[PDB]
Amino acid sequence: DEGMWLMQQLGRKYAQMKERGLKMKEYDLYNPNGTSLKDAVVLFDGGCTGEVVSDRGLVLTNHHCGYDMIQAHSTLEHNYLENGFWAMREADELPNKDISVVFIDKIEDVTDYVKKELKAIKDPNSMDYLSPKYLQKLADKKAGKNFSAKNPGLSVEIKAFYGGNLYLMFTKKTYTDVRLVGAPPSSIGKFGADTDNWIWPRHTGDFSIFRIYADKNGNPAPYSEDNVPLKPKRFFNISLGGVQENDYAMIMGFPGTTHRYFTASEVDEWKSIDNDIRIRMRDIRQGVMLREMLADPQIKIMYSAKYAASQNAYKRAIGANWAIKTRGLRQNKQAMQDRLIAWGAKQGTPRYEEAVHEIDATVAKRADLRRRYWMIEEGIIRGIEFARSPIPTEDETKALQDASARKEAIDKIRTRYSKFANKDYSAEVDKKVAVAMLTEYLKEIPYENLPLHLRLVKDRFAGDVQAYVDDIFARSVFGSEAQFDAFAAVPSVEKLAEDPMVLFASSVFDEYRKLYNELRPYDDPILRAQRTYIAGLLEMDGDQDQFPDANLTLRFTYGQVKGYSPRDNVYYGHQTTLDGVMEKEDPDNWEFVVDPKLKAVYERKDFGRYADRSGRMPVAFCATTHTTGGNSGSPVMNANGELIGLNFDRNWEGVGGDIQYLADYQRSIIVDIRYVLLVIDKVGGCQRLLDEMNIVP
């Protein structure tokens, strides 16, 4: 609903944005033929957003966005992940291998061009209209003969929007020498850690600092000791005016995916298959894992990351199912499609109703297969560690059946066994997880639909899942180190072919691939019908109050700094303070440890010009902007386009917002720029970064 707008849509939205508080001129925010604020936004490392905040190429993004780079430069002598990092001179800034920043140099509507090229249709069912290979061939044809050679650092890309009803060509400028400049300690950068993931109120200082480097002329160049900081076209001014409740706020960034044009049948499928299976299976997996972690401190160390990784999409699915149950998402999709069908009936065009019917029929037809796919994926592929145990390759089996190539096969199988049964793998914990996961899987999936090896639970083990799992480990070459070494000393292909763990792993992966291959053909009729469906919605209600689905391209969103009521008699305000960090401090809980320098700043009220009018130190705020994954690190702007914060999360109540925006619950969780500048200043003591920024009173 309140959307993720194309840069092209700024003109038609500008008057509403101005009426909601926007004060800057339209072309100062986005101008297709000149420098604008859009030129200070970057796609940071392929999946995050960033922003240029100085005339020397300084870039701000989230701490969780720059996390891998902070970790790659961290050692026992200089643990930057734990203590932070503050380069005191430009020469001290650390280079990063495999990093990139993408500027969106130009954006152009190429719809008529693509649609004319598509008219050369050798099959009306062709999926070339959505093919990256096909669209790249059109982008190259339009850009010219050797565009990348004649314009180094530039590249061209065409993307489909609105289900193939609109196409845009992006001219991108990519820089690959992006150095680490500064980062707060993890105690600030990820204060809530996993406990506060998707949570508002939030007290996390989620930021990190980088710098784009380039050749002498400001052109992209790979890492070189001769590289000089980039003088950019445009950079954000930092505001110290802060935020007030109801203030206008806007974001530019790269939201990844949404499903705003789902039919009511796709919402039901998302709930009853995708979300219910993921919720049920992960709750079983996590329940066994947590009991083992709480009983053995060594198991807690080995399984903490696996547990946290499983919980992230589990929490998302819980938040999504809450919106489906309470916010009428299914009903609003049904009303949307009924309105189009009634309009099509009045216009004498039945193709829109036929398109919704095709989507419904495809959803209803793939139901059993999709249920079986999610059941095996959540239950076994993700749920059971020994599902990803070593499977001897075709060439490994061939090698073991008269040359020195036998020792090569054993060394390769050993390397994979050592990665599977690593320092964090417990066979006992895995057997307990598998017994609970398989009991549920065997209750849901009938004998005729089971992976071939799982048929042995009924046929050979008289229904005893525990005995079947015990037997896999007791007899398998991968059941223990001593069992592998005995095999490695005298390896036979016939031992591997009958190995209970190899057979289980092969069998479950075979069933997983068979289901994937059977389900793949159902995607195309839905995609083709969505092109007709979205064309109708656009022709009926216009390319105005319905935004194109997110597709990792540059979008803008606007709203207000506003809290919300999560439940009866509870209100969460629009702004958190440093006081809230101190309330959450728990010295013996690694997630809620408070940095001693920050604790002292709070005690002494050493807030400088960064505190609010009441002398309180702001930390984070929330806004009615419409964001999703991909928007991490996005610049948050004032009514004047000045930087007031960085987007870093969204509350769980708004995760259903990828299908239907939730005005009374959905909020972008943003780190206040005053808190960012406080941490750089009083925690990092990196005055040179403050000095190179243009800070407005």
Ligand X SMILES: O=C(COc1ccc(F)cc1)N1CCCC1
The count of chain residues that interact with ligand X, using the rule CB under 6 A, is 14
Contact residue for ligand X among 63, 64, 260, 315 (CB under 6 A): 315
Would you count residue 334 as binding Cl ion (CB under 5 A)?
A: no
CA–CA separation, 217 and 567 (whole Å): 56
Q: How far is the CB of 350 from Cl ion (least distance, A)?
A: 5
Distance CA 276, CA 317 (A): 8
Question: Looking at 206, 268, 543, 681, which residue is catalytic?
Answer: 206
Binder of residue 233, out of ligand X, Cl ion, a second copy, none (CB less than 5 to 8 A by kind): Cl ion
- CB-side exposure of 104: number of CA atoms within 13 Å? 30
Among positions 625-664, residues that touch Cl ion (CB under 5 A) are: 662-664
Chain positions 256 to 295 lying near a second copy, rule: CB under 8 A, are 291
The answer to whether 475 contacts a second copy (rule: CB under 8 A) is: no
CA atoms of 253 and 630, how far apart (whole Å): 7
Q: Which does 322 bind (CB under 5 to 8 A by kind): ligand X, a second copy, Cl ion, none?
A: ligand X
Tell me how far apart the 2 most distant CA atoms of the chain are, in Å. Answer: 82
Residue of 314, 437, 449 lying closest to 379 (CA atoms): 437
The single residue of 64, 453, 574, 626 carrying the catalytic annotation is: 64
Beta bridge pairs of residue 19: none
User: Least distance in Å: CB of 619 to a second copy?
Assistant: 9
Nearer to a second copy, 214 or 671 (CB): 671
Q: What is the DSSP letter of 42?
A: E
Q: Within 549-568, which residues bind a second copy (CB under 8 A)?
A: 563, 567-568
- Considering only residues 522-561, where is the footprint of ligand X by CB under 6 A? 543
Scanning the structure block, which residue is given the tokens 């005893």?
Answer: 464
Backbone phi and psi for residue 365, each to the nearest 5 degrees, phi listed first = -65, -40
**Of 139 and 686, CB closest to ligand X:** 139
CB of 50 to Cl ion, least distance (A): 13
Q: Could you tell me the sign of the dihedral formed by the alpha carbons of 690, 694, 696, 697, in that order?
A: positive
- Output DSSP code: residue 644: E
Contact of 411 with 522, CB cutoff 8 Å: no
DSSP secondary structure letters along 393-434: -HHHHHHH---THHHHHHHHHHHHHHHHT-TT--HHHHHHHH
If the CB atoms of residues 505 and 623 are measured against a second copy, the closer one turns out to be 623
**Cβ closest to ligand X, residue 267 vs residue 526:** 267
Q: Interior CA angle at 650 toward 242 and 188, to 5°? A: 65
570 binds, among Cl ion, ligand X, a second copy, none (CB under 5 to 8 A by kind): a second copy
Catalytic, 632? Answer yes
Choose one: 74-82, 350-358, 514-522, 641-649; the region binding Cl ion (CB under 5 A).
Answer: 350-358
In the complex, minimum distance from the CB of residue 88 to Cl ion, in angstroms, rounded to a whole number: 26
Distance CA 337, CA 329 (A): 13
Is 63 assigned a catalytic role?
A: no
Count of residues near a second copy by CB under 8 A: 17
Q: Where are the alpha helices (DSSP H) in 183-296?
A: 186-189, 264-269, 276-295
176 belongs to the binding site for a second copy (CB under 8 A) = no
Question: Residue 109's binding partner, choosing from ligand X, Cl ion, a second copy, none, with beta-carbon cut-off 5 to 8 A by kind?
Answer: ligand X
Cα–Cα distance for residue pair 613/640, rounded to 1 Å = 20
Instruction: Please state the closest distance from residue 169 (CB atom) to ligand X, in A.
Output: 11
Whole-angstrom Cα distance, residue 47 to residue 552? 8
Q: Is 39 a catalytic residue?
A: no
User: Interface with Cl ion by CB under 5 A: which residues?
Assistant: 232-233, 349, 351, 662-664
Q: Residues with catalytic annotation?
A: 64, 206, 632
User: Interface with ligand X by CB under 6 A: which residues?
Assistant: 6, 8-9, 109, 166, 197-199, 315, 318-319, 322, 543, 652
User: Interface with a second copy by CB under 8 A: which residues?
Assistant: 201, 203, 291, 563, 567-573, 575-577, 579-580, 583
